[PDB]
């Protein structure tokens, strides 16, 4: 816009999905060639979690029984 | 159609061929 | 052996039709023959030949 002000010169898809799935497929079969779990990167993420809820469920019993004044 | 009656609310490719041949 | 088959899905290319033909060409044969030998049994190879 600055250059024009200074000069003056103004003015379907499914083709893909398949093109994906094989990748999505050749993906997994490869893992078998290396035995490389693509879910361990989540199970951690879930056990890190279930342990949390309970970790917390403890933590809030206290704030409920004792009080945030006491605790803090 | 039954739900609407009960409620009342009516109303190029060559990209592929190559994408095949290699396969 | 795996990337093989999954590819087929990208083209939907049966790798067994090249046998099912080979089997129906067959079951039809046995019976085709089972007829043919009843005759040689009932009539005789002299008659037939």
């Amino acid at each position: 816009q600055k250059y024009a002000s200074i000069v003056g010169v103004d003015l379907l898809e499914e083709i893909t999905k398949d093109h994906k799935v094989l990748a999505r497929q050749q993906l997994q079969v490869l893992a078998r060639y290396l035995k490389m779990d693509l879910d361990n990167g989540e199970r951690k993420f879930l056990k890190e979690k279930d342990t949390v809820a309970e970790l917390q469920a403890q933590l809030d019993y206290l704030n409920a029984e004792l009080g945030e004044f006491f605790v803090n």
Side-chain angles (χ1 to χ4, degrees), chain A residues 56-69 71:
Chain A
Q56 188 82 38
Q58 299 174 354
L59 187 65
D60 50 0
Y61 202 56
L62 310 199
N63 321 137
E65 197 87 25
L66 282 175
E68 290 62 1
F69 208 100
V71 175

Side-chain angles (χ1 to χ4, degrees), chain A residues 4 8 12-56:
Chain A
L12 279 171
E13 320 179 4
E14 304 87 344
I15 173 176
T16 72
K17 278 61 163 208
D18 189 276
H19 204 175
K20 309 281 211 170
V21 311
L22 75 169
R24 179 67 252 196
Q25 287 183 52
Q26 63 96 6
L27 168 58
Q28 204 74 230
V29 63
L30 282 165
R32 323 211 175 108
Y33 175 40
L34 290 79
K35 301 177 288 296
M36 204 273 281
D37 192 315
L38 303 181
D39 300 328
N40 295 6
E42 279 271 332
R43 282 163 186 151
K44 160 268 195 189
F45 207 101
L46 272 47
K47 276 39 171 173
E48 167 166 357
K49 222 187 205 196
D50 286 348
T51 61
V52 156
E54 65 90 33
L55 191 82
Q56 188 82 38

